[PDB]
């Protein structure tokens, strides 16, 4: 997260970290057994970490659970990042508590102008590298399709939306992939891609969760 503030410990209880040695993507706990993330986050041997704030330091609310199964969306395209979504089933259910809680799925898509919360442990510099210890937050509006498509000519499919600021200066960024974009208490977005971070006229691009609610509720209750 570039431009953001510090969420505070466990105030975003559905945020998880995907770890293979180190933190490399986020995700969102959508019940005690399943997390949603970006399909480009797929790796074999994911460990999922719940109840984190400081990723380097054990504060004892955490739960560490391996992924038992990862189900990349059937129409995922790694060249275009279209359908950039994936479900991870946990090897055990997590315990839900006040630090560890799941986020609802939307019943409709959200409109342009609607303010959302984005979180993650990714890079906080738009030039250079600075990776934080503690979870950062950002509030950012869904931008129009027009303005998205013109920011990224050719690259915006119907499964994506832009959120952020055409001015630059605040955006998500590397190591935030797969993490939540939450608007009115529903998971609308997954952190997916951008051209740089926080660059003027290049807002972040997010997977459009409302286009997938069926496929998720399908997959989850069938696996």
């Amino acid at each position: 997260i570039v431009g953001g503030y510090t969420c505070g410990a466990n105030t975003v209880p559905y945020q998880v970290s995907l770890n293979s040695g180190y933190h490399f993507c986020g995700g969102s706990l959508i019940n005690s057994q399943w997390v949603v993330s970006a399909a480009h986050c797929y790796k074999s041997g994911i460990q999922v970490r719940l109840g984190e704030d400081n990723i380097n330091v054990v504060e004892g609310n955490e739960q560490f659970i391996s992924a038992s199964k990862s189900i990349v969306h059937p129409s995922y395209n790694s060249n275009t990042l279209n359908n950039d979504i994936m479900l991870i089933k946990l090897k055990s259910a997590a315990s839900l508590n006040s630090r560890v809680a799941s986020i609802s799925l939307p019943t409709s898509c959200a409109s342009a102008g609607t303010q959302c919360l984005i979180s993650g442990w990714g890079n906080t510099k738009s030039s250079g590298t600075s990776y934080p210890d503690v979870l950062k937050c950002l509030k950012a509006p869904i931008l129009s399709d027009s303005s998205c498509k013109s920011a990224y000519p050719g690259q915006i499919t119907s499964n994506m939306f832009c959120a952020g600021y055409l001015e630059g200066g605040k955006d998500s960024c590397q190591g935030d992939s797969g993490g939540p974009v939450v608007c009115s208490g529903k998971l609308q977005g997954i952190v997916s891609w951008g051209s740089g971070c926080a660059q003027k006229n290049k807002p972040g691009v997010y997977t459009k969760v409302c286009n997938y609610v069926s496929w998720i509720k399908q997959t989850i209750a069938s696996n």
Partner: peptide
């Protein structure tokens, strides 16, 4: 450029996804 927001160590550009490149402190971006 299309660069996914994953945290990925690299040593050369060609290590990275998509049209990310390998930047100065050994991470894609």
């Amino acid at each position: 450029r299309v660069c996914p927001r994953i945290l990925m160590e690299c040593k050369k550009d060609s290590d990275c996804l998509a049209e990310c490149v390998c930047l100065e402190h050994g991470y894609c971006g």
